[PDB]
Amino acid sequence: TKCTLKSFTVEKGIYQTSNFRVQPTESIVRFPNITNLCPFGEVFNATRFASVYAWNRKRISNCVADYSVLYNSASFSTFKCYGVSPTKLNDLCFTNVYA
Amino acid sequence: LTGTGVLTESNKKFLPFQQFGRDIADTTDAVRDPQTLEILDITPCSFGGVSVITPGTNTSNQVAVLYQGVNCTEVNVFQTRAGCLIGAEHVNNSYECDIPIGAGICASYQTSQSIIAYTMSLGAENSVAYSNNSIAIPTNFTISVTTEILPVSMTKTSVDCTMYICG
Amino acid sequence: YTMSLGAENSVAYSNNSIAIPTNFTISVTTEILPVSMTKTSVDCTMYICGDSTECSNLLLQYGSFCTQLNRALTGIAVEQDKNTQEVFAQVKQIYKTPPIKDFGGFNFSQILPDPSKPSKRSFIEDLLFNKVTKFNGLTVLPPLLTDEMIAQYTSALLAGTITSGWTFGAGAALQIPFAMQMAYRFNGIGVTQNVLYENQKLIANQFNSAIGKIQDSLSSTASALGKLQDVVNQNAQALNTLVKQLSSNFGAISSVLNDILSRLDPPEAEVQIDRLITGRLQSLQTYVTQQLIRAAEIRASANLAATKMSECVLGQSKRVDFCGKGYHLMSFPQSAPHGVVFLHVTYVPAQEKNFTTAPAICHDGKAHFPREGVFVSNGTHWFVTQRNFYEPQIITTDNTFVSGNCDVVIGIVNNTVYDP
Amino acid sequence: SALGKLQDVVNQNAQALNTLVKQLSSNFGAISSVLNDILSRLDPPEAEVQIDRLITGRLQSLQTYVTQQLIRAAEIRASANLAATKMSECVLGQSKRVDFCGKGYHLMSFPQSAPHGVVFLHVTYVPAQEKNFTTAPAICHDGKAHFPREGVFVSNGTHWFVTQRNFYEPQIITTDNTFVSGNCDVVIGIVNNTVYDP
Ligand SMILES: *[C@@H]1O[C@H](CO)[C@@H](O)[C@H](O)[C@H]1NC(C)=O
Ligand SMILES: *[C@@H]1O[C@H](CO)[C@@H](O)[C@H](O)[C@H]1NC(C)=O
Ligand SMILES: *[C@@H]1O[C@H](CO)[C@@H](O)[C@H](O)[C@H]1NC(C)=O
Ligand SMILES: *[C@@H]1O[C@H](CO)[C@@H](O)[C@H](O)[C@H]1NC(C)=O
Ligand SMILES: *[C@@H]1O[C@H](CO)[C@@H](O)[C@H](O)[C@H]1NC(C)=O
Ligand SMILES: *[C@@H]1O[C@H](CO)[C@@H](O)[C@H](O)[C@H]1NC(C)=O
Ligand SMILES: *[C@@H]1O[C@H](CO)[C@@H](O)[C@H](O)[C@H]1NC(C)=O
Ligand SMILES: *[C@@H]1O[C@H](CO)[C@@H](O)[C@H](O)[C@H]1NC(C)=O
Ligand SMILES: *[C@@H]1O[C@H](CO)[C@@H](O)[C@H](O)[C@H]1NC(C)=O
Ligand SMILES: *[C@@H]1O[C@H](CO)[C@@H](O)[C@H](O)[C@H]1NC(C)=O
Ligand SMILES: *[C@@H]1O[C@H](CO)[C@@H](O)[C@H](O)[C@H]1NC(C)=O
Ligand SMILES: *[C@@H]1O[C@H](CO)[C@@H](O)[C@H](O)[C@H]1NC(C)=O
Ligand SMILES: *[C@@H]1O[C@H](CO)[C@@H](O)[C@H](O)[C@H]1NC(C)=O
Ligand SMILES: *[C@@H]1O[C@H](CO)[C@@H](O)[C@H](O)[C@H]1NC(C)=O
Ligand SMILES: *[C@@H]1O[C@H](CO)[C@@H](O)[C@H](O)[C@H]1NC(C)=O
Known part of the structure; x- marks a missing residue:
């Protein structure tokens, strides 16, 4: 009370100092069962990409994607992320990604 | 979907295509387990408000703590409508309201000098002997001069922005 | 169509014609007055951030706005209590009614409360209460004086x-x-006490009929307590708007702080957190300003209600159209949710009659x-009769006073x- | 503690002024809260943005202060109107309004000057020493x-x-202070x- 009132004397009355809040004990990482690692050797390590006006769009779903092995490979010049961060992406589940 | 809360069971019936869920205020209160098909219920963590009922520091340093919107189980003990007051005792008497707690409960520092919690009294219990042939005519009087203070004005201040914002 | 301002009446004004009423009627009215509102306490930090230390560290850079809003809300609550x-x-x-309830026919x-029901309000107050019918930082504080x-x-x-x-x-x-008491009330508005002492039965019957009509109207309709319902609806709409203001992006990527923190790194998410904080703070300041204006209005209404209580229930006000339309007699307060109801018992005249009047008379x-x-014919x-009740009396020397000769009038x- | 409302008004004004002065210590997201230090340490490009943010923050704070000051000024205007009404109706006359100037039958009032306020000395007439009697609506002689x-006819x-209503002063029931209206089988x-x- 003396800290929230910024003084050393307190008169008779009721003062709302702070609030109560239970702290969490542990954390869960509940995720579904997924296999069939998404093939990145055909999207990146392909024979030859198409032209700019005829870019190839390939839908990929029902897989598990590891985005850390791409940035840490030190083989990509630019790895700019928009809307998301270069990290904190291996802990999220996407609905439908494109390439 | 991340966050914190008490994952308890529920009674609502999620449709086969429905996975997540919301409430009246568009707040997620129930989701589905990714592994199994059990319908959970995201109950928010326990939290509320804390109020410190204390007398003047010149009198004593004994204080009390009131937890607002709790059920005496989320934290000598008193279950009130405003909350659960831990630090005072519930007496059966009734005095004037010194420290308004809420819902009629009032706290005061009385003697064994401790903090008590009682119900405020609305005044004395008087009963006029009303009858069809009874009147009470006064036989004396007493002139009483009372005081009444009302503010008329305040300090005339003036804040120049061209000197406050940009010095 | 075009609204009509009222009926078209033409008073037959004349220098020798007067209309003295020959009867009366007791008409009890009803007035609704808000006294207080619901004491709310919006947690600034929990509303802006919601259990986020990274967001709190950025909110602390805006100054003492949290403390200002908390002090404003506390002052509003104390004001609504003192109202x-x-x-x-x-x-x-605390006075109580005697067991023998024989108030001269009333x-x-x-x-008055009855022991048939549990320890609660009376029948009219129960009807009034029946007709007027833990969050994301927005808690509700209970009032000090319970129902x-x-x-x-x-x-x-x-x-x-x-x-x-x-008294x-x-x-x-003082017992009386x-x-x-009714005789004194009548003498307070000019009418003599013999009118009451002769028509007490009729006056009690009219009062009972008016009370029954008020009870039937309150049991039939529910929009009689319009002001209280309007205040409750305004408060509920303000709270709902303040809650829904948490679903807006305010230019950010999303309105979910935990999702933003899980997706973007802190350096890039600092701007989004700042934008969300600015938006939520602006919304909360607008809410607090509107709440302060509404609290000032409610304080004015509560002061008016306290004045109308002190000057009409604890006495007999002589102000016109202040505590009832007509000649005020008495009033009874009734409890209401976040308000008060007065039963203004007034003295309303009845069918009058045309007579011939004269300013004075000359005998010798x-x-x-x-x-x-007034002299009527x-x-x-x-x-010579009264001014509010036709009672023809013989013009004697004890009813009139002589002042000068009858040549200048x-x-x-x-x-x-x-x-x- | 008599001038509690005046002390509270003074304390509220002082707290508002202190908060308005202290709001200059926050940067509102800027690098620092010292405008001169910012102007001396940064180039005009970034200094423009820093000054814009500081101006936005200080303008929001000043607008909040002015809004609160307007609310308090409206409250003080209402209080001053009430005080002037009480003055005109109790010091310049005798008010008949119940519980308007003192708790009791108002007699007179005396104004007293106070810092940013006014104090009234309401003289009231409070009856005391009440005695029980038997009353009757009317009497019939002939x-x-x-x-x-x-x-009031008391016994x-x-x-x-027959005595007064606010002071017991018995008098013989004569035809001077008593009129005739009606009969003895209607009352x-x-x-x-x-x-x-x-
Ligand atoms: C999913 O995987 C877990 C181990 O990761 C395994 O125990 C479980 O049987 C699998 N199937 C289901 C339906 O959970
Ligand atoms: C693709 O080629 C890179 C070489 O830059 C190699 O590191 C990587 O393992 C290969 N496969 C995939 C799936 O990226
Ligand atoms: C479904 O609705 C019925 C009434 O419409 C209700 O009785 C029942 O409890 C509900 N079931 C739920 C909410 O699971
Ligand atoms: C919670 O508070 C209520 C209110 O008196 C009380 O009746 C009840 O026993 C408490 N505990 C639980 C588990 O409900
Ligand atoms: C007055 O009250 C008494 C007590 O109940 C009763 O006996 C008496 O008849 C009443 N008198 C009148 C005139 O009502
Ligand atoms: C009336 O009360 C006053 C005290 O206020 C006292 O001095 C006086 O003697 C009393 N008069 C009678 C007649 O009792
Ligand atoms: C007579 O009284 C009636 C109302 O009872 C009124 O409408 C009418 O104008 C009066 N006439 C005269 C001549 O006073
Ligand atoms: C009253 O009005 C009548 C009608 O106009 C008129 O003849 C008479 O002189 C008036 N008397 C007075 C005293 O004005
Ligand atoms: C006066 O009006 C009432 C109705 O409120 C009626 O009962 C009563 O008979 C009337 N009196 C006269 C003298 O007409
Ligand atoms: C008063 O009215 C109620 C209902 O309107 C009735 O039950 C009661 O008997 C009445 N009182 C008397 C004394 O008749
Ligand atoms: C009243 O008498 C006087 C004196 O005789 C006379 O002048 C006057 O006109 C009379 N008034 C009326 C209305 O007849
Ligand atoms: C006027 O009243 C008196 C007594 O009340 C009566 O003698 C006289 O006949 C009445 N005149 C008219 C025109 O009614
Ligand atoms: C009047 O009567 C009441 C109750 O009957 C009693 O308390 C009071 O003392 C009486 N007053 C006098 C002066 O006898
Ligand atoms: C008053 O006198 C009349 C005369 O007949 C009588 O009828 C009546 O009963 C008397 N009153 C009382 C209270 O005795
Ligand atoms: C009432 O007052 C009269 C007049 O002074 C007196 O004669 C009588 O004895 C008194 N009675 C009582 C009971 O005081």
Whole structure:
């Protein structure tokens, strides 16, 4: 009370100092069962990409994607992320990604 | 979907295509387990408000703590409508309201000098002997001069922005 | 169509014509007055951030806005408490009604509490309460004076009124029969006490009929308490808007702080957190400003209600159209959710009659002016009656006073005064 | 503690001024809260944005302060109107409004100057030492009703007297302070008595 009132004397009355809040004990990482690692050797390590006006769009779903092995490979010049961060992406589940 | 809360069971019936869920205020209160098909219920963590009922520091340093919107189980003990007051005792008497707690409960520092919690009294219990042939005519009087203070004005201040914002 | 301002009446004005009423009617009205609102306490930090230390560290860079809003809300709560504390708690001793309830013929069954139901409000107050019917940082604080305490205050006020009149508001309550109390109420508006002492039965019947009509109207319709319902709806809409303002992006990527923290790194998410904080703070400041304006309006209404209580329930106000349309007689407060209801018992006139009047009369060369009343005629004879009730009395020397000769008064009849 | 409202107004004004002064210590997201330090350490490009953010923050704070000051000024205007009404109705006259100037029958008031306020000394008339009596609506002497003009018919147990309403002063029931209206079988509560004729 003396800290929230910024003084050393307190008169008779009721003062709302702070609030109560239970702290969490542990954390869960509940995720579904997924296999069939998404093939990145055909999207990146392909024979030859198409032209700019005829870019190839390939839908990929029902897989598990590891985005850390791409940035840490030190083989990509630019790895700019928009809307998301270069990290904190291996802990999220996407609905439908494109390439 | 991340966050914190008490994952308890529920009674609502999620449709086969429905996975997540919301409430009246568009707040997620129930989701589905990714592994199994059990319908959970995201109950928010326990939290509320804390109020410190204390007398003047010149009198004593004994204080009390009131937890607002709790059920005496989320934290000598008193279950009130405003909350659960831990630090005072519930007496059966009734005095004037010194420290308004809420819902009629009032706290005061009385003697064994401790903090008590009682119900405020609305005044004395008087009963006029009303009858069809009874009147009470006064036989004396007493002139009483009372005081009444009302503010008329305040300090005339003036804040120049061209000197406050940009010095 | 075009709204009509009212009926088209043409008063037959004349310098020798007067309309004195020959009857009356007791008409009890109803007035709704808000006294207080719901005491809310919006947690600034929990509303802006919601259990986020990274967001709190950025919110701390905006100054003492959190403390300012908390102090404003606390002041609003204390003000809403003191409003009802000054409106209802205007009596020191809690009076009670005697067991033998025979108030000269008046029936206060639905007004006074009854032991048939549990310890709660009376029948009319229960009807009023029945007709007016833990969050993301927005908690609700309970009022200090509970509904039972407000009901006990209203019952004590009713008992003190019925048993004393206005003597309980200036010191110690003085016992007095309700018949003599009504006689004093009538004498306070000019009407003599013999009218009441002769038509007490009719007046009690009219009062009971008015109370029954009020009860039937309150049981039939529910929009009678419009102001309280409007205040409740405004508060609920303000709270709902303040809650829904958390679903807006305010230019950020999303409105979910935890999702933003899980997706973007802190360096890039700092700007999004700042934008969300600015938006939520602007919304909360707008809410606090509107709440302060509404609290000032409610304080004005509560001051008006306390004035109308002190000057009309603890006494008899002589102000026109202040505590009832008509000649005010008495009033009874009734409890209401976040408000107060008054039963303004007024003295309304009835069918009048045309007579012939004169400013004075001259008997022996001197002008005789009416001391208390007015000179009226029925075509052949002249009588001095009251101003609000037709009671023809013989014009004697004890009812009029002589002041000068009858040569300067513009208009005077040559009547014949009677010397007892 | 008598001038509690005045002390509270002064404290609220002082707290508002102190908060308005202290709001200059926050940067509102800027690098620093010192405008001169920012201008001396940064180039004009970034200094423009820093000054814009500081101006936005300080303008929001000043607008909040002005809004609160307007609310308090409206409250003070209402209080001053009430005080002027009480002055005009109790110091320049005798108010008949119940509980308007003192708790009791208002007699007179005396104004007293106070810092940013006014103090009234409401002189009231509070009755005391009340005694129980037996009252009656009217009396009948010769078959005609008798109602008192101004007073109440009270009896000490054996004799009926007419006294004032706010002060016990018994007087013999005469025809001067009593009028006749009606009969003795239309009033509920008639009491047979003898009216004296001077
Ligand atoms: C999913 O995987 C877990 C181990 O990761 C395994 O125990 C479980 O049987 C699998 N199937 C289901 C339906 O959970
Ligand atoms: C693709 O080629 C890179 C070489 O830059 C190699 O590191 C990587 O393992 C290969 N496969 C995939 C799936 O990226
Ligand atoms: C479904 O609705 C019925 C009534 O419409 C209700 O009785 C039942 O409890 C509900 N079931 C739920 C909410 O699971
Ligand atoms: C919670 O508070 C209520 C209110 O009195 C009480 O009746 C109840 O026993 C408490 N505990 C639980 C588990 O409900
Ligand atoms: C009336 O009360 C006063 C005290 O206020 C006292 O001095 C006086 O004697 C009393 N008069 C009677 C008649 O009792
Ligand atoms: C007579 O009284 C009636 C109302 O009872 C009124 O409408 C009418 O104008 C009066 N006439 C005269 C001549 O006073
Ligand atoms: C006066 O009006 C009432 C109705 O409120 C009626 O009962 C009564 O008979 C009337 N009196 C006269 C004298 O007409
Ligand atoms: C008063 O009215 C109620 C209902 O309106 C009735 O039950 C009661 O008997 C009445 N009182 C008397 C004394 O008749
Ligand atoms: C007027 O009243 C008197 C007495 O009340 C009566 O004698 C007289 O006949 C009345 N005149 C008319 C025109 O009604
Ligand atoms: C009253 O009005 C009538 C009608 O106009 C007129 O003849 C008479 O002189 C007036 N009397 C007075 C005293 O004005
Ligand atoms: C009243 O009498 C006087 C004196 O005789 C006379 O002048 C006057 O006209 C009379 N008034 C009326 C209305 O007849
Ligand atoms: C009047 O009667 C009441 C109750 O009957 C009693 O309390 C009071 O003392 C009496 N007063 C006098 C002066 O006898
Ligand atoms: C009432 O007053 C009269 C007049 O003074 C007196 O004669 C009589 O004895 C008194 N009675 C009582 C009971 O005091
Ligand atoms: C006055 O009340 C008493 C007590 O109930 C009763 O006996 C008496 O008849 C009543 N008198 C009148 C006129 O109502
Ligand atoms: C008053 O006198 C009349 C005369 O007949 C009588 O009928 C009546 O009962 C008397 N009053 C009382 C209260 O005795």
